[PDB]
Amino acid sequence: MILDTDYITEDGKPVIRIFKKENGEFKIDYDRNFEPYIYALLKDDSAIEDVKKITAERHGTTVRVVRAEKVKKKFLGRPIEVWKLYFTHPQDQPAIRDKIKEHPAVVDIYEYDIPFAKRYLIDKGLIPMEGDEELKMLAFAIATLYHEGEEFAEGPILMISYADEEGARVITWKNIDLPYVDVVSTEKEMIKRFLKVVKEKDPDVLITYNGDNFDFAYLKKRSEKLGVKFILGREGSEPKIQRMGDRFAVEVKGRIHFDLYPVIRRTINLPTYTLEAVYEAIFGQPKEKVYAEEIAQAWETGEGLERVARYSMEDAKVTYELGKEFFPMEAQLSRLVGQSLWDVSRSSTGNLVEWFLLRKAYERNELAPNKPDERELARRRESAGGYVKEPERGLWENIVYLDFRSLYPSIIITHNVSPDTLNREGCEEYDVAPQVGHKFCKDFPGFIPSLLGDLLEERQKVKKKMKATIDPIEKKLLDYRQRLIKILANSFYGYYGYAKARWYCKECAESVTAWGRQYLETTIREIEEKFGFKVLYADTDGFFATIPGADAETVKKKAKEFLDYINAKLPGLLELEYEGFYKRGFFVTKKKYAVIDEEDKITTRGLEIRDWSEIAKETQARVLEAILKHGDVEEAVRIVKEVTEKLSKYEVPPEKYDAEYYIENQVLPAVERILRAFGYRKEDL
């Protein structure tokens, strides 16, 4: 399988390198015949001879147009003839693109800023991370001597830890009596020992937590200070430090540097992103933090070195565990988007769709539009929000939740919403978005709706293959692919309003939201007027409904009957589904509610919880239980009165003191936010 691609220069000519792992062995394939190129749109084809002679200069080298070729492509749903201009080196493109654009006979230039190594994967139809190859992984972490008024990496590295299938170990230059600690004489010897470990283990993946902005930079500065050959690449190179935006990223040639930090930063939403908080959120297990002051104090003639070595060991161990949890998902994401795991794991959702579209555009001979210039970028201010019903406050019995299956992708497909179909003149059929009035041609399938349709079809083909796959490892992998297709399909709407997007269409985005608001509001009035349901609450693509004075099985039956009715009325791919049944449910405000199923599991959208005392969290759970399991509001009130009395009589442990503070600032605020809708103010208790 393909792990990554890059290029090196030999005699001024680019040489693509394809890093592979085939049949358990590392390989490097070279391609010396891939030519960089750009497209140029001309006002007259006779002008090609003048544009071929356009020159620029990169160093002492004169940059010329090597070869031109007339090509016929599709651009915004219309055929177009452009000239494919070839160059010697990919770095010639930024040097000459402006001179070619400024030529009077040139209307515009295209596909001039697609990185050479990524251009290669797309054009060759190559997909990284494809196959069943087993990748060897190794996580690592470092512990450093920190003092407040010092420069970066002024203090030495105290410990280097690593972890894999064999376990976790710590390399240090102080005598620590632990079985997993390897003692060396100096910091230099510790770094050298780490390099030998990586070289001998030869992992395909190096896993870190913030290694892009800390670990590698620290190791680099210390290796320069100590005169150590910091070679980690499989081809004898040092880690390459790159600038993506305001921060950094690190590549290790021949391997995949998998930094968990950017991945977890976009997967889960947490108040803090410390390694301890992220491990505790994913695995539900606590992890002790040992601060820089404690580590410095312990190192400077300290007995607590075993505690710091254990912290170092746990850093590598949890990094390996987290890497095992997120790597298979990123591998499937890489295979779906068609780019290396290194790029994919560091990319935003908007850029992931862009790479997917760039590949599909090449396969379909679709000329890609350019990224917005600085002027157009400033003009792309977001004007976006679905329908939110104000909830009917109070306690409700036997509530069903109905929602649309992929509402926004269904709208895009059904109404052919795309920049290439927007206000296109000359069609015999159009769909008009309500409120915003944008028209979309229906005669020809649009570029994006066509791909979105194939994504949904591919998702179903993957789901069927998953049910038939006996192999549990492959079943989990197919589960990732099917979930990733859903995520990618549900990213097209956001991509339409993504300011940096090539296929940007604010009109498309507004139209999807407007149609979405229409379908949800139409369905609500339909279930109220034709089935006598009460819609308690609704948000964007679904609603909670019930029949005041009806049995649980009666509500279920009429809900299924409504589904048969409205699904026959809904156009194209739009489909309403039965998501789940709830015995009880109370709706406080927009985005604040709580429901309970027949199993007695409570789902909450406004829970108050580690910067909150256990007494407040326990009372809240007791209140919710009384409301959702017993349906007794009078009991929920009594519980709070009981807890406040136990706190005031000093009968409650302080953590699990100022009795007035824990009543007025802890218990009451956490419980009032739930009992609020009933009219139970703080003065009501």
From Swiss-Prot:
InterPro entries in the cross-refs: DNA-dir_DNA_pol_B, DNA-dir_DNA_pol_B_CS, DNA-dir_DNA_pol_B_exonuc, DNA-dir_DNA_pol_B_multi_dom, DNA/RNA_pol_sf, DNA_pol_B_thumb, DNA_pol_palm_dom_sf, DNA_pol_type-B
Keywords noted in UniProt: Disulfide bond, DNA replication, DNA-binding, DNA-directed DNA polymerase, Exonuclease, Hydrolase, Multifunctional enzyme, Nuclease, Nucleotidyltransferase, Transferase
Gene: pol
Record function comment: In addition to polymerase activity, this DNA polymerase exhibits 3' to 5' exonuclease activity.
Catalysed reaction equations from the record: DNA(n) + a 2'-deoxyribonucleoside 5'-triphosphate = DNA(n+1) + diphosphate
Family: Belongs to the DNA polymerase type-B family.
Residue pairs linked by disulfide bridges in the UniProt entry: 427-441, 505-508
Name of the molecule in the record: DNA polymerase
Swiss-Prot/TrEMBL GO biological process terms: DNA-templated DNA replication
Gene3D superfamilies: DNA polymerase family B, C-terminal domain, DNA Polymerase, chain B, domain 1, Helix hairpin bin, Palm domain of DNA polymerase, Ribonuclease H-like superfamily/Ribonuclease H
Regions that span the bilayer: none
Enzyme Commission number(s) of this protein: 2.7.7.7
GO terms assigned for molecular function: DNA binding; DNA-directed DNA polymerase activity; exonuclease activity; nucleotide binding
Pfam families, sorted: DNA_pol_B, DNA_pol_B_exo1
